[PDB]
Amino acid sequence: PMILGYWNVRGLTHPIRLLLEYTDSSYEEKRYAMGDAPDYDRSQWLNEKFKLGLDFPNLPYLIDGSRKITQSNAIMRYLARKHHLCGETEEERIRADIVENQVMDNRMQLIMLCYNPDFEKQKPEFLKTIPEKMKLYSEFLGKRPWFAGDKVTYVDFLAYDILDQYHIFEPKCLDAFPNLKDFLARFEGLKKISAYMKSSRYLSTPIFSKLAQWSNK
Ligand X SMILES: N[C@@H](CCC(=O)N[C@@H](CS[C@@H]1c2ccccc2-c2ccccc2[C@H]1O)C(=O)NCC(=O)O)C(=O)O
* Binding site listing for glutathione: 6-7, 42-45, 49, 58-59, 71-72
Closest C-alpha among 116, 99, 117 to residue 162? 99
Establish how many alpha carbons lie within 13 A of residue 31's alpha carbon, considering only the half-sphere containing its beta carbon: 13
CB atoms within 10 A of CB 163: 24
187 binds ligand X (CB under 6 A): no
Among positions 9, 63, 79, 130, the unique one binding ligand X when judged by CB under 6 A:
9
Q: Compare residues 49 and 186 and give the one whose CB is closer to ligand X.
A: 49
12 binds ligand X (CB under 6 A): yes
Provide, rounded to whole angstroms, the least separation between the CB of residue 65 and ligand X.
20
Among positions 67, 172, 201, 217, the unique one binding its own copies when judged by CB under 8 A:
67
DSSP codes, 46-111: HHHHTTS--SS--SSEEEETTEEEESHHHHHHHHHHHHT-S--SHHHHHHHHHHHHHHHHHHHHHH
8 binds ligand X (CB under 6 A): no
Residue ranges that bind its own copies, judged by CB under 8 A: 55-56, 58, 67, 69-74, 77-78, 81, 90, 93-94, 97-98, 100-102, 105, 108, 136, 139-140
